[PDB]
Chain A
Amino acid sequence: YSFKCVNSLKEDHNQPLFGVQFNWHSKEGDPLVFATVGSNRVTLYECHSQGEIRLLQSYVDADADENFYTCAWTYDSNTSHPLLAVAGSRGIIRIINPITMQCIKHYVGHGNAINELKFHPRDPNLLLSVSKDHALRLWNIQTDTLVAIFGGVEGHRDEVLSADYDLLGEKIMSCGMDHSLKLWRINSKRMMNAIKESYDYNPNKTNRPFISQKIHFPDFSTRDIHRNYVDCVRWLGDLILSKSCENAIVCWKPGKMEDDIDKIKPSESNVTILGRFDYSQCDIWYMRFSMDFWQKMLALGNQVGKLYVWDLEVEDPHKAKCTTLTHHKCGAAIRQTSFSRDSSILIAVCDDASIWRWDRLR
């Protein structure tokens, strides 16, 4: 846990940024490239040696006023082009191809702002959207169709704030303002049938509009872990990591300790907690923590501009001490951090449109 900052950039509009996403879809050897969304613009950069960050691209939306919130990186199987998905307050989800330097798709089917975008780890053509409409949506980005809508009689009731796929792509966790954490399953026959039907829907084939899937009942819901806002959850193997306004990250698992995750009955009413990670100065919400692709370390932003880095090695809830890498320039706040495909560099975003970088030394 030893990084040496080598660069620090500042934008021009000085409006806060929210998203950083390394492109993990680059062949080994291709240059490291990442994206960053802000007030109403996006930015595309490449990382170079000696702490050099070279500007590559930037777009802007002038037709209205909106706040972009997140971003997502995938690829197109047909022609091998990179694809970037962005989402903002207007509820529109925009899919853009950097190769053609043009927006290629837009999806508008929500009722409020979008908060998180994630894709299926195996399927590159399933897009998951989390919104302020209390419901989660899942689209097929190829056939221009929806697949399933999560939410309803027994679902979230207030402001779903985040969701996360498991390491394999058949279980999803969701968390919102109503202090509730809910589990959705994708391995059911229902979901694969809907997916397989979604991969074949020609509008010029039948007079019937496509039939979506409504899921009104989660696999397991609870409000006992925290007692306040929960804004970020993460799959760590078969364990769950989550955060609240209680300045402490918690790792736990559903059911009892001996219980498995593929035998949990839907009417479960007991949760086994495992451990806690301590830090300070997280009194406001909307800060996300990130983990490396190899699942070997953890990074988390801070309001006073500091950092907190742990390791997912043999050591775990014991302590792992608390590595803090800080600099004297920006102490505004930090929204999201990101690692490259390997552990080379770590990027963080400060609240005043200032981007940072920390290279990995020994």
Chain B
Amino acid sequence: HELFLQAFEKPTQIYRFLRTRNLIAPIFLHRTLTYMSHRNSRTNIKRKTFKVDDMLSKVEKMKGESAHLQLTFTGFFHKVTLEVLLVKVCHKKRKDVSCPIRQVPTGKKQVPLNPPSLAVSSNEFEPSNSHMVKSYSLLFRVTRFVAQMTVFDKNRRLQLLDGEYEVAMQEMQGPTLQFTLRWTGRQKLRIFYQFLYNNNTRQQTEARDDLHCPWCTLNCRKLYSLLKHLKLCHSRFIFNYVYHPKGARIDVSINECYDGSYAGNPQDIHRQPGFAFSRNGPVKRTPITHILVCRPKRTKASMSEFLETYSSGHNRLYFHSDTCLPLRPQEMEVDSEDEKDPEWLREKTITQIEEFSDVNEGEKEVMKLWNLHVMKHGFIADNQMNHACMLFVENYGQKIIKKNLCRNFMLHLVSMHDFNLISIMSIDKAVTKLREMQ
């Protein structure tokens, strides 16, 4: 019994608060769904005759069809100084966070102890600015015991009649203050939910009414509607129908595969706490087009739960190929973090070249420079080689002059010609270029 409450501890608490929020602030009107249409009763038989001018006509016809009041006190039956103020509330503006208050005083006289003091109010309150003020109120503040009494109603119609009344008082059997005020001018089914946990049943219940969603108390009519509502609006569960012949049976299991993933900006998830989910501000987003409903078929009206999306673009967070860090949409540009020449390869080439003992530096330097050049450009065809050579004397020549390694360079050219890849003219021209540049 502890096990299954532990199991259903996670969804039930969410669903209770969701019940409350949905009842007070709904997502969709439940009468508009296809499988609960019986909830709505009216029909669209008046969008053919309604003339908007008749709205004016009827409304005008139906809806077509000051005083300085004084109040006198009789004494405060306490077990002491008091004053009367008119306190009213102004309508909320976009600037003003909440409804502001305004109090105007009168400054009356004190009252005798447990037995003169009176006021004659006026038209100080303005009914003209109904666009500004919400409602007024008469107040009995000050200790030595506070009371309040609204005067006008929602549509600014005063309800405080003429007469003598006794009102109580409270700090910040009890104190009292009497006064007077006058204007001066079909059988029940046996659906048994059967909760399951650890592959064995651990509980059963009974909702003897036709049905209610136990988590949200929505009252749909028929069994098919019940299964429809339970299966969709409570996806975190896995409902299941069998046909117990006398009645109906329902089972429950926590869904191991529920799409509880975040369904918004796939960049806000990996943001240091505090900077996550900023909302306020414009952010670049990766294009994504969906088709959730294109053209449905109203197949039959029943016999499906018990008898028996398109995509495009990018809908995921991409990652850097080497760090396993997230990839920004801006960085998702033509940059591809991939090219022919990785640095570790070059360094390994140098280290492996230096590993040899029967080689002279006057040869190793030339070997390294040519290897780096070839790796940098990646020549493939034989006919490219000659151009390669001139490019080389155009590129690394400065450095070679810094080392004066030209004599070994000529030797390397001769060895290259020994492999039938260079001509006499190419070698001679490269030597000329090196001499001229030197």
Query: B328: CB under 8 A from chain A?
Result: yes
Instruction: Write the chain A residue with the least CB distance to B276.
Output: A106
Residues of B within 8 A of A108 (CB): 270
Q: Could you tell me if B325 and A109 are in contact, using CB atoms closer than 8 angstroms?
A: yes
Instruction: Write the chain A residue with the least CB distance to B319.
Output: A109
Shortest B317–chain A CB gap in Å is 12
Shortest B203–chain A CB gap in Å is 25
Residues of B within 8 A of A212 (CB): 322-323
Query: B273: CB under 8 A from chain A?
Result: yes
Given A207-B330, A207-B331; A105-B344 close (CB under 8 Å): no
A238-259 interface bits toward B, Cβ cutoff 8 Å, 1 = contact, 0 = none = 0000000000000000000000
Query: B174: CB under 8 A from chain A?
Result: no
Given A104-B273, A106-B273, A109-B324; A207-B344 close (CB under 8 Å): no
**Given the complex of chains A and B, what is the CA–CA distance between A216 and B343 in angstroms?**
9
Query: A152: CB under 8 A from chain B?
Result: yes
Of B325, B335, B347, most buried by chain A (CB within 10 Å of CB) is: B325
Residues of A within 8 A of B186 (CB): none
Residues of B within 8 A of A217 (CB): 347, 351
Question: Of the candidates A144, A149, A207, which one forms a contact with B323 in the assembled complex, judged by CB atoms under 8 Å apart?
Answer: A149
Query: B272: CB under 8 A from chain A?
Result: yes
B334-345 interface bits toward A, Cβ cutoff 8 Å, 1 = contact, 0 = none = 010000000110
Question: Of the candidates A102, A105, A146, A216, which one forms a contact with B325 in the assembled complex, judged by CB atoms under 8 Å apart?
Answer: A146
Residues of B within 8 A of A29 (CB): none
Query: A103: CB under 8 A from chain B?
Result: yes
Given A106-B272, A106-B273, A109-B325; A209-B320 close (CB under 8 Å): yes
**Given the complex of chains A and B, what is the CA–CA distance between A144 and B271 in angstroms?**
10
Which residues in window 190-212 of A have CB below 8 A to B? Answer: 207-209, 212
Shortest A136–chain B CB gap in Å is 14
Which secondary structure characterizes the binding site on chain B?
A: loop
Instruction: Write the chain A residue with the least CB distance to B343.
Output: A214
Q: Could you tell me if B347 and A216 are in contact, using CB atoms closer than 8 angstroms?
A: yes
Q: Could you tell me if A153 and B344 are in contact, using CB atoms closer than 8 angstroms?
A: yes
Q: Could you tell me if B331 and A209 are in contact, using CB atoms closer than 8 angstroms?
A: yes
Shortest A147–chain B CB gap in Å is 11
**Given the complex of chains A and B, what is the CA–CA distance between A144 and B320 in angstroms?**
16
Residues of A within 8 A of B245 (CB): none
Residues of B within 8 A of A102 (CB): 273
Which residues in window 309-358 of B have CB below 8 A to A? Answer: 320, 322-325, 327-328, 330-331, 333, 335, 343-344, 347-348, 351
Residues of A within 8 A of B325 (CB): 109, 146
**Given the complex of chains A and B, what is the CA–CA distance between A108 and B269 in angstroms?**
12
Of A152, A207, A209, most buried by chain B (CB within 10 Å of CB) is: A209
Shortest A161–chain B CB gap in Å is 21
Shortest A62–chain B CB gap in Å is 10
Query: A111: CB under 8 A from chain B?
Result: yes
Query: B163: CB under 8 A from chain A?
Result: no
Residues of B within 8 A of A216 (CB): 344, 347-348
**Given the complex of chains A and B, what is the CA–CA distance between A27 and B152 in angstroms?**
67
Question: Of the candidates A104, A111, A152, which one forms a contact with B324 in the assembled complex, judged by CB atoms under 8 Å apart?
Answer: A111
Query: B185: CB under 8 A from chain A?
Result: no
Query: B274: CB under 8 A from chain A?
Result: yes
Q: Could you tell me if B344 and A144 are in contact, using CB atoms closer than 8 angstroms?
A: no
Q: Could you tell me if A209 and B272 are in contact, using CB atoms closer than 8 angstroms?
A: no
Residues of B within 8 A of A152 (CB): 344
Residues of B within 8 A of A149 (CB): 323
What are 10 residue pairs bridging A and B, where the CB atoms are less than 8 Å apart in the complex? Answer: A104-B273, A104-B274, A106-B272, A144-B272, A146-B323, A207-B333, A209-B320, A214-B322, A216-B344, A217-B351
Question: Which residues of A are at the interface with B, using a C-beta cutoff of 8 A?
Answer: 102-106, 108-111, 144, 146, 149, 152-153, 207-209, 212, 214, 216-217
Other A-B pairs, 20, CB within 8 Å; known A106-B272, A106-B273: A102-B273, A104-B272, A104-B274, A109-B323, A109-B325, A146-B323, A146-B325, A149-B323, A152-B344, A207-B330, A208-B331, A208-B335, A209-B327, A209-B328, A209-B331, A214-B322, A214-B344, A216-B344, A216-B347, A216-B348
